[PDB]
Amino acid sequence: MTYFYVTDYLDVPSNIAKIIIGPLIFVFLFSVVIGSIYLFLRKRQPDGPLEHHHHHH
């Protein structure tokens, strides 16, 4: 009755569909955080070496 296992190699349950997209859902959650977080990333201008480097005033 080992054939069962041998047949498991020729069958991909929906579990692969959750293990396939699931991993991405994680990446999407990471991007979503950096997104709302990015907002605060604009609450500080690049006071790098000397300012100016512009034209208008």
Based on the model shown, name its key terms.
monomer; 57 residues; mainly alpha; 2 helices; 0% strand; rod-shaped; transferase
Brief sketch in words of this structure:
The protein is mainly alpha-helical and 57 residues long. Helix content is 58%, strand content 0%. This is Insulin receptor subunit beta.
Query: How big is the Rg?
Result: 25 Å
- Approximate helicity band: 55-70%
Calculate the terminal CA-CA distance, rounded to whole Å. 82 Å
What string, H for helix and E for strand, traces the elements in order? HH
Strand content: under 5%
- What is the global morphology? rod-shaped
Number of helices: 2
* Number of extended strands: 0
- Judged by helices, strands and strand pairing, the structural class is mainly alpha
Main sheet overview: none
Count of discrete structural domains: 1
